[PDB]
Structure formats: C-alpha cells, structure tokens
Amino acid sequence: TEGKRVVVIGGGLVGALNACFLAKRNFQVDVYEAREDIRVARSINLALSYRGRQALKAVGLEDQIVSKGVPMKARMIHSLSGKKSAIPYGNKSQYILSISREKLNKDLLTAVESYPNAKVHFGHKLSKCLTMLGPNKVPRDITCDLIVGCDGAYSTVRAHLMKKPRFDYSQQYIPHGYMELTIPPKNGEYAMEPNCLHIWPRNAFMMIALPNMDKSFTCTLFMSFEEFEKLPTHSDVLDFFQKNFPDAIPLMGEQALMRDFFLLPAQPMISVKCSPFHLKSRCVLMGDAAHAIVPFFGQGMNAGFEDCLVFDELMDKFNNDLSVCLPEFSRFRIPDDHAISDLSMYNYIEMRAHVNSRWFLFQRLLDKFLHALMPSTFIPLYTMVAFTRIRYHEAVLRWHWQKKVINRGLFVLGSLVAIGSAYILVH
Amino acid sequence: TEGKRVVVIGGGLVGALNACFLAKRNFQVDVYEAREDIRVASINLALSYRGRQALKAVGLEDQIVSKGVPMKARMIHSLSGKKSAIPYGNKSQYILSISREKLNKDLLTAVESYPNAKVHFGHKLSKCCPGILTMLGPNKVPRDITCDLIVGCDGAYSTVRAHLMKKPRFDYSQQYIPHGYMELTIPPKNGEYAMEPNCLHIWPRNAFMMIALPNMDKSFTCTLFMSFEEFEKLPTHSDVLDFFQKNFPDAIPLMGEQALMRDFFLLPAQPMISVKCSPFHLKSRCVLMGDAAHAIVPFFGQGMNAGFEDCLVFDELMDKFNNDLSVCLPEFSRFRIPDDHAISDLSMYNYIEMRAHVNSRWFLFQRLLDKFLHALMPSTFIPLYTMVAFTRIRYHEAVLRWHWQKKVINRGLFVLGSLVA
Ligand SMILES: Cc1cc2nc3c(=O)[nH]c(=O)nc-3n(C[C@H](O)[C@H](O)[C@H](O)COP(=O)(O)OP(=O)(O)OC[C@H]3O[C@@H](n4cnc5c(N)ncnc54)[C@H](O)[C@@H]3O)c2cc1C
Ligand SMILES: Cc1cc2nc3c(=O)[nH]c(=O)nc-3n(C[C@H](O)[C@H](O)[C@H](O)COP(=O)(O)OP(=O)(O)OC[C@H]3O[C@@H](n4cnc5c(N)ncnc54)[C@H](O)[C@@H]3O)c2cc1C
Numbered sequence: 086t087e088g089k090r091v092v093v094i095g096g097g098l099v100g101a102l103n104a105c106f107l108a109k110r111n112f113q114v115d116v117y118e119a120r121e122d123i124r125v126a127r128s129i130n131l132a133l134s135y136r137g138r139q140a141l142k143a144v145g146l147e148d149q150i151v152s153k154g155v156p157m158k159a160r161m162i163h164s165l166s167g168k169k170s171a172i173p174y175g176n177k178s179q180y181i182l183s184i185s186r187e188k189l190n191k192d193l194l195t196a197v198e199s200y201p202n203a204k205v206h207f208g209h210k211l212s213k214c215l216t217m218l219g220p221n222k223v224p225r226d227i228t229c230d231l232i233v234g235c236d237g238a239y240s241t242v243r244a245h246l247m248k249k250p251r252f253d254y255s256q257q258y259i260p261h262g263y264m265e266l267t268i269p270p271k272n273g274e275y276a277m278e279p280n281c282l283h284i285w286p287r288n289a290f291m292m293i294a295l296p297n298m299d300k301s302f303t304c305t306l307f308m309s310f311e312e313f314e315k316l317p318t319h320s321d322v323l324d325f326f327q328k329n330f331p332d333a334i335p336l337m338g339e340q341a342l343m344r345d346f347f348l349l350p351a352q353p354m355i356s357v358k359c360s361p362f363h364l365k366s367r368c369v370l371m372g373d374a375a376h377a378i379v380p381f382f383g384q385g386m387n388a389g390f391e392d393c394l395v396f397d398e399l400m401d402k403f404n405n406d407l408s409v410c411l412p413e414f415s416r417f418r419i420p421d422d423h424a425i426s427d428l429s430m431y432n433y434i435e436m437r438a439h440v441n442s443r444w445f446l447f448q449r450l451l452d453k454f455l456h457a458l459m460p461s462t463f464i465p466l467y468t469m470v471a472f473t474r475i476r477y478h479e480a481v482l483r484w485h486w487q488k489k490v491i492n493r494g495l496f497v498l499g500s501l502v503a504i505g506s507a508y509i510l511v512h
Numbered sequence: 513t514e515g516k517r518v519v520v521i522g523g524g525l526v527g528a529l530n531a532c533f534l535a536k537r538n539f540q541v542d543v544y545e546a547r548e549d550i551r552v553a554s555i556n557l558a559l560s561y562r563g564r565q566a567l568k569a570v571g572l573e574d575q576i577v578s579k580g581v582p583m584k585a586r587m588i589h590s591l592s593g594k595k596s597a598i599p600y601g602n603k604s605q606y607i608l609s610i611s612r613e614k615l616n617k618d619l620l621t622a623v624e625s626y627p628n629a630k631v632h633f634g635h636k637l638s639k640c641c642p643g644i645l646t647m648l649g650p651n652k653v654p655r656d657i658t659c660d661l662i663v664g665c666d667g668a669y670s671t672v673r674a675h676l677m678k679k680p681r682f683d684y685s686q687q688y689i690p691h692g693y694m695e696l697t698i699p700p701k702n703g704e705y706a707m708e709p710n711c712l713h714i715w716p717r718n719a720f721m722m723i724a725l726p727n728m729d730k731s732f733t734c735t736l737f738m739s740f741e742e743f744e745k746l747p748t749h750s751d752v753l754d755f756f757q758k759n760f761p762d763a764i765p766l767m768g769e770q771a772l773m774r775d776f777f778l779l780p781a782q783p784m785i786s787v788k789c790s791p792f793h794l795k796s797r798c799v800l801m802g803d804a805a806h807a808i809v810p811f812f813g814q815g816m817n818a819g820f821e822d823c824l825v826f827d828e829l830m831d832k833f834n835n836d837l838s839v840c841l842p843e844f845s846r847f848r849i850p851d852d853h854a855i856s857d858l859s860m861y862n863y864i865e866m867r868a869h870v871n872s873r874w875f876l877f878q879r880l881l882d883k884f885l886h887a888l889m890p891s892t893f894i895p896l897y898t899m900v901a902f903t904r905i906r907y908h909e910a911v912l913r914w915h916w917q918k919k920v921i922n923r924g925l926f927v928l929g930s931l932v933a
C-alpha cells in the first residue's frame with residue numbers, strides 16, 4: 086500500500102535510486118546517510134550501461150544522467166610499442182558511457198527529495214537494529230515496515246543479517262589494489278580520443294582511463310600490492326612507467342604523476358558474496374551491501390541499480406506483498422548478482438595471466454568474427470552484460486555454451502584440415 | 513618466559529589443550545569458559561595420530577587413550593543386510609572412539625594440574641583489543657582485563673574471530689551446508705555390544721548417511737546426517753520408523769525400537785557450518801586456533817585432530833623461535849593455514865562425494881583398490897586415509913601426493929587400457 090514506512094540505510098548511488106523507486110510507489114521513505122550532504126559539503130567516475138540506464142529510466146532520471154556523461158563508443162587499446170588499436174563496442178547503437186560518481190549521487194539525492202513523501206537524513210549513522218543523529222550517542226532509532234540496506238560494501242545491515250541462521254557469507258581482499266591518476270587537457274582539448282574506453286592492458290599491471298567533461302580523463306591503475314611496495318621513490322615510479330606504460334608520461338603531467346601517485350596509498354578491492362539477501366519480509370540488502378564485486382567489468386553500479394529495478398518489477402508483479410517480494414528477490418536475483426561477481430573475478434584473473442597489447446585484440450576481434458558469422462547464436466560476452474538485461478547467470482551459461490561450440494566446431498575444422506593436407510599431399 | 517600473561521578464550525577441546533601446552537612453558541595462563549564447569553554441572557569422536565601426537569606432547573595421550581575404544585576397521589552396512597569389514601591400513605594403525613565430554617574434562621583437569629594456570633568458568637567475552645571485556649558469573653558485570661596474548665579457542669562461532677574479521681586484509685567465509693545432524697544411540701543387547709565393537713560403522717546411503725562409534729559401556733553412539741529438507745518430512749514417530757525401515761532397515765533392531773523415538777525427537781537437527789579464514793593472527797597480540805580458525809564439516813573425523821595439531825605446531829614454533837610471539841604468530845599463519853585449509857577442503861570434498869558416489873558398494877571398491885596399490889608399491893602409493901589418520905604428512909602435501917597418485921594411476925592405467933587395447 087501507500088502508508089507503510091521504509092528506511093533506506095545509505096544515501097549512496099543505490100540507496101538514493103531505491104528511495105526514488107519506493108517514493109514513486111507512495112511509500113514513506115526515510116533515507117539515513119552517514120556522511121554530510123555532498124551537494125553542500127571510491128571511484129571518481131564510472132561506466133554506465135544498459136542495465137543501470139534501464140533502472141534510471143524507470144524513475145525518469147536516465148535523460149538527466151546521460152546528458153552529463155561522455156559516450157564511449159569503443160575500446161582504445163594502448164600497446165607497449167605505442168600502437169593505439171581501436172575496437173568498437175558491439176553494434177553502432179550500443180555504447181557504454183562515462184559519468185561521475187558525484188554528479189550521479191547528487192542528482193539522485195535531489196531526485197529523492199523531489200518526492201514530498203521522502204526525506205533524507207544526512208549525518209545519520211547506524212550501530213544495531215539504532216540510527217545516530219547529528220550528535221553521536223543521540224540514539225534515537227525509529228521503526229518501519231521495511232529496512233533496506235544500501236550501506237555499501239562494508240555494510241552494517243549485512244553485519245546483523247550475517248549473525249542470523251542459514252546465512253552464507255564470504256569476503257576476499259584480492260592481490261591487487263587501485264589508485265587514481267588524471268590525464269589533463271592538452272591545450273584545452275582532450276589529450277586522447279575522447280569517445281573511447283582507454284585500456285593499457287599489461288598482465289600484472291593494467292590501466293584504464295575514462296573521459297570527463299572538463300577535457301580530462303581519469304585513470305585508475307591496477308597492480309599487485311607487491312609492486313606498490315617496489316615503487317617508494319619518484320625515480321622508481323618514473324622507471325616503472327617508462328618500462329610498462331610509455332605513452333602515459335607525456336599524456337599525464339610528468340611531475341603531477343608524482344604528486345598524484347604518492348597522494349594517498351593504493352586502495353584494496355574487496356569481494357563480498359552473501360546469501361540470501363533478505364530476512365522474513367522486514368529486511369533486504371541491495372547493491373554493494375548485497376554484493377561487492379572487484380571492479381573488472383564496469384558493472385557494480387549497473388548491477389546494484391538493476392537490483393532496484395528487479396525489485397520494483399516484483400512489487401508490480403506481486404501487488405506490493407513484501408512477504409512475497411523479499412523471498413523472490415533473493416531467489417531471482419542472487420543467481421545473477423553471484424554470476425556478475427564471478428564474471429568480474431574471472432576477468433580480473435584472466436587479466437593477470439595473459440592480456441597484453443596483443444591478446445585483447447585477438448580475443449575481441451575473434452568475438453566480432455563469430456557474431457558476424459553466426460548472429461544470433463553467438464553474441465559476445467561484453468555485448469550480453471553491457472548492452473542487454475539477459476540475466477547474468479544465463480549470460481554465463483550462453484557464454485560457456487558458445488565457447489563449447491567454438492571449441493568443438495574448431496576441432497572438426499582442424500581435423501578436416503589435418504586429413505585434407507595428407508590426402509592432397511599423397512594424391 | 514615467566515613474566516608474560518596470556519588469556520585463552522574458551523575452555524573447550526582446543527582451548528584446554530592449548531592452555532596446557534602454554535602453562536607447560538611457564539606462561540601465566542587464564543582460560544575463560546562461557547559454560548559452567550562441565551565436570552560438576554558429537555557426543556563422541558574419532559581420535560587419531562595428529563591429535564594423539566599433541567596429546568603426547570603434554571603428557572596426556574595415555575590418560576585419554578585408556579578411556580577410548582579402538583576402531584580397527586570400517587564396517588559397512590549395505591542396504592541388503594550385508595556387512596563388509598575393511599581394515600584400517602595396518603595392525604598398528606587404528607583410529608579410536610572417545611567422548612567429547614570425558615576428553616574435555618580430563619583436559620580441564622590437566623589445565624588445573626599446573627599452578628600457573630587458572631580456568632574461569634561461567635565467564636563469557638564481549639569485546640577485545642590489541643584490554644578485553646569478559647563477563648562475570650553475574651551478567652552485566654563487565655570487568656576489563658589485560659594480557660600479552662589472547663588465544664581465540666571459542667569455537668566455530670567465535671567472538672574473538674568476529675573482531676579480527678573487522679580488520680583489514682582479512683579473508684573470511686562461512687557456508688552452512690544443506691545437511692544437519694542428529695545423535696542416536698544403539699544400546700547394549702543383553703549387556704553386550706550390539707555389533708562389532710572395534711569398527712567404525714558406516715551406513716552410506718547418499719542423501720542420508722549414518723555412522724556409529726562404540727562407547728565403553730556397551731553402546732554405540734550414532735550420528736545421522738540428512739538434508740534439513742528430509743528432517744522436516746518426519747514429524748511423527750510413524751514417519752521416522754517408516755523412514756528407518758526404508759533407508760536403515762537393520763537399525764530398528766540394533767537401536768532401541770523406541771529409544772530411536774526418544775532420541776530422534778529429543779532436540780532438533782543441528783546445522784553444520786564450514787568456516788575458513790586468513791590469516792590466523794593479529795600482529796603478535798592475538799591468534800585463532802581450532803574451530804575459531806577452521807570449522808570443517810564433520811566428514812573426515814579430523815576436526816578436533818587438526819585443532820590439536822594447531823596447538824602442537826604452535827609449540828614447535830615457540831621452541832624453534834625461543835618464545836617470540838612476534839615471530840610465532842605470523843609463522844603459525846604461514847605454516848598452518850595451507851594445511852588447515854587443505855583438511856577443510858578434504859572434508860567437504862568427502863562430504864559431496866558421499867552424496868553422489870558412495871552407496872553401499874563404491875566404498876569397498878575404492879578402499880580395496882587403494883589397498884592393492886599400497887601393497888604393490890608401499891612407498892610411491894600411500895592411501896589417503898592412512899596419510900591423514902596415521903601420519904603427520906602435512907595436509908596440503910597429503911592432498912598433493914593424493915592428486916599426484918590419482919594422476920599417475922589415471923595416466924598409467926589409461927596407458928595399459930588404451931594402448932594394449
Ligand atoms: C575502483 C572502482 C571502480 C568502479 N567502477 C565502476 C564502473 O565503471 N561502473 C560501475 O557500474 N560500477 C563501478 N564500480 C562500482 C560502484 O562504485 C559501486 O557498485 C556503487 O557505488 C554501489 O553503490 P552503493 O550505494 O551500493 O554503495 P556506495 O555507492 O558506496 O554507497 C554506500 C553509502 O552508504 C553510506 N553508509 C555506509 N555505512 C553507513 C551507515 N552505517 N549508516 C548510514 N549510511 C552508511 C555511505 O556513506 C555511502 O554513501 C566501481 C567501484 C570501484 C571501487
Ligand atoms: C557431528 C560432529 C562430529 C565430529 N567428529 C569428529 C571426529 O570424529 N574427530 C575429530 O577429530 N573431530 C570431530 N569433530 C570436530 C570437533 O567437535 C571440534 O573440532 C572441536 O570441538 C573443536 O574444538 P574447539 O575447542 O576449537 O571448539 P569447542 O570444543 O566448540 O570449544 C569452544 C568453547 O569455547 C566456549 N566459548 C565460545 N564462545 C565463547 C566466549 N565468547 N567467551 C568464552 N567462552 C566461549 C564454548 O562454550 C566452548 O566450550 C566433530 C564435530 C561434529 C559437529
């Protein structure tokens with residue numbers, strides 16, 4: 086109904102979005118956010134794709150968000166040799182796009198408040214369920230028909246649910262860390278091709294850069310905390326970059342590279358899985374609180390946004406019965422949120438075994454070959470996760486099946502070539 | 513050295529054992545047990561080489577071994593009534609049945625045998641730090657207390673580990689498997705053991721499994737494993753009987769025809785939880801052992817055994833490195849995590865395998881096969897159960913050797929098979 090009351094823990098990306106969806110069902114939605122309001126007072130800028138945009142569209146916020154973001158119509162792949170090689174993102178209609186964490190969070194919090202039946206309570210944190218006010222130890226919690234945990238990867242709500250029975254949970258800090266470095270404008274234009282995801286794929290080290298609107302790119306650098314150990318000196322940084330990423334040094338400030346590198350230390354990436362996502366129609370997790378995935382497919386925000394949407398579809402489908410919706414969310418969504426978590430991890434692993442200048446290209450071009458050969462039966466993985474709402478686990482199934490039929494189908498051509506050689510050679 | 517204070521959280525199997533080991537190198541050791549003294553106020557488990565070696569280290573092997581029943585073989589109850597006994601590898605090598613309780617009581621008492629040790633019953637813990645907050649006999653008496661070492665031996669649901677979990681770079685995972693477990697008892701018949709008293713008795717259905725271990729009165733205690741699902745489908749005495757008739761037909765005579773009823777409805781199926789984490793320490797002030805560090809699913813009889821080996825390996829390190837906890841805590845994590853993850857894995861593998869590929873028969877084949885090849889090549893092939901039960905081959909190496917073996921067999925006999933045919 087309308088006059089049930091729901092509290093959203095977290096005024097983040099997902100928290101805000103959810104509060105919009107819920108406000109839009111005429112719920113009374115109170116959003117509690119630890120930090121002070123970011124419009125007055127982790128990733129700097131992220132990749133927004135079909136799934137997230139479809140969630141944004143259900144609240145009539147897609148157009149606003151899309152207008153502040155720069156399109157990425159292709160990958161641009163920076164070889165060690167200096168060779169820049171550019172592969173488009175699937176079809177001509179499909180592109181991912183680069184937006185800013187904060188512009189996104191800000192517009193969303195504003196959208197939250199635009200619903201008169203919704204408040205957002207900045208400077209409120211949470212200890213048990215016990216929300217704090219402005220002054221700490223002002224424990225003035227207050228009850229609700231739904232508590233929605235959108236408190237992110239280090240989730241308080243999840244922490245309570247983890248103590249409950251038959252709750253599987255896991256948390257892995259991976260070997261690599263990330264740190265942000267910014268490419269500026271060169272004479273007031275973009276120093277690189279600005280409608281491209283820029284990748285510098287080495288194996289143990291990888292860099293990406295995503296265009297902003299002030300004509301800059303922000304780059305994240307990934308490498309094992311091991312190598313972060315090995316560059317304590319400005320000379321080392323320089324030497325490293327000269328070795329592994331030659332064309333960055335000119336692109337980035339040669340000297341600002343050193344201010345920005347040592348500005349604060351490499352960030353850890355956590356992976357948390359859990360099951361199930363809910364508790365007896367009084368409590369549910371969503372986004373990074375439910376799944377926190379290593380940032381290796383551009384899908385963490387997209388998936389958490391999609392949680393919000395999938396929920397909202399179940400609230401339509403089951404006329405707002407939380408006792409139905411909460412177990413159904415967990416049944417329907419956990420497979421997918423786990424599968425994207427796996428995809429993300431697979432990718433990260435793959436990217437340290439073998440992706441160099443060269444492999445990236447072969448892998449994608451081969452993918453493009455086979456789609457062009459046999460559409461629809463082969464759709465590349467990237468297309469499936471980035472440009473559709475095919476369920477993630479299904480996309481994994483299809484992606485395995487496809488790889489099975491490419492391997493089996495290659496074998497017979499290899500062997501028919503192998504008999505064809507000998508028969509034409511003898512006679 | 514003598515000046516150092518240590519607290520052991522939990523006065524369980526591992527906690528009490530560790531407290532001995534520590535007391536025995538002159539620490540000031542205080543054990544804090546949330547329960548009341550079980551000596552005044554898994555019922556029974558499978559002791560083996562690893563545990564016995566740790567027990568030996570502290571002068572308590574003999575005391576414990578006196579009160580247990582040797583199980584010199586497996587005894588396999590097939591659905592038809594057939595009962596095949598496969599021996600444990602060697603006449604010297606047997607596993608033995610003991611009580612959780614008697615074991616826990618003798619260790620508590622041995623802890624108290626040392627003048628520099630105290631155990632503090634009815635004391636629970638709230639919060640700790642690298643200053644801890646233990647509860648008194650009266651709830652809400654939160655007195656602080658300090659120490660040079662805090663050893664988390666507080667079990668599968670470990671308070672101390674909950675604190676480590678919050679710290680950075682700390683990997684942790686919990687998984688409750690589908691099956692729970694229930695204890696049942698085969699009494700004595702006419703004052704004697706109702707079955708061969710020196711076997712581990714196994715009834716391997718797939719979705720349902722059951723084992724039985726002798727006690728010293730002339731009974732066996734059984735554990736029944738099945739999916740919590742099936743447990744839900746047996747609410748009445750009739751259903752339990754009707755089930756037992758289907759899956760474990762020889763039991764209804766063996767077990768009290770209605771002792772079964774008393775015991776099955778005595779209290780609900782208990783869940784089995786796998787927990788894994790890394791690392792096992794926090795920078796020389798704090799260390800996890802036994803189930804706090806590794807709760808494994810109970811399908812290799814190794815849980816207590818590994819936890820006891822933890823205590824032994826810590827002692828070995830404290831010897832090697834002259835009691836430097838700055839060195840031993842990281843070295844413990846470094847040396848022991850691979851092994852303690854390995855046995856966790858072995859345990860779970862075993863448990864999945866026992867839901868698909870062991871009916872009555874595969875158990876015999878697999879074991880007999882394995883026995884054949886040991887006899888053929890006593891050094892290059894040692895069977896799995898022998899390596900875990902009867903040696904201190906490190907768990908991870910045992911899994912290596914084991915995989916290697918499986919490969920040389922698969923390759924070598926696929927060579928005989930495919931080439932000569
Ligand atoms: C390096 C990196 C790159 C990434 N790149 C991409 C990308 O390209 N594309 C993409 O889709 N995703 C990306 N992601 C994923 C994305 O950052 C997250 O998935 C997304 O922020 C999840 O939103 P959320 O609201 O669940 O968590 P958050 O956005 O972190 O929000 C959590 C909010 O809850 C608040 N909070 C925490 N605790 C409490 C409490 N006790 N009480 C009240 N409030 C609390 C916090 O203050 C915060 O505002 C990336 C992540 C990283 C780390
Ligand atoms: C069905 C089953 C069969 C098993 N069979 C075998 C087998 O055949 N062989 C084998 O080797 N192992 C077996 N195990 C494993 C064995 O039971 C455990 O390995 C062993 O009990 C772990 O010892 P521990 O001292 O770490 O944990 P526990 O023995 O559980 O000790 C934890 C202790 O700490 C106390 N405590 C907990 N929290 C606090 C707190 N906050 N403050 C103070 N005190 C606290 C608890 O009261 C308890 O006494 C089996 C387990 C199960 C469930």
Ligand SMILES: Cc1cnn(-c2ccc(OCc3ccccc3)c(C(=O)O)c2)c1-c1ccc(Cl)c(F)c1
Nearest residue numbers: 132160284291293380381382383435440445448467
């Ligand atoms: C932020 C964002 C948005 N999309 N992607 C992304 C991720 C992975 C991809 O596959 C890599 C691969 C191709 C072929 C073989 C193995 C791996 C592709 C792709 O297909 O272009 C695109 C990222 C991203 C994030 C971090 C790193 Cl390190 C990175 F390279 C890219």
Ligand SMILES: Cc1cnn(-c2ccc(OCc3ccccc3)c(C(=O)O)c2)c1-c1ccc(Cl)c(F)c1
Nearest residue numbers: 558586714721723810811812813862865875878897
């Ligand atoms: C308490 C205790 C002590 N040892 N074991 C044990 C465990 C596993 C074993 O391997 C099984 C297997 C044999 C052959 C092939 C696959 C698997 C063997 C063995 O080889 O005898 C013995 C148990 C135990 C615990 C739970 C169950 Cl369910 C169980 F059956 C026995």
Ligand SMILES: [Cl-]
Nearest residue numbers: 380383384385
């Ligand atoms: Cl991500």
Ligand SMILES: [Cl-]
Nearest residue numbers: 810813814815
């Ligand atoms: Cl066990």
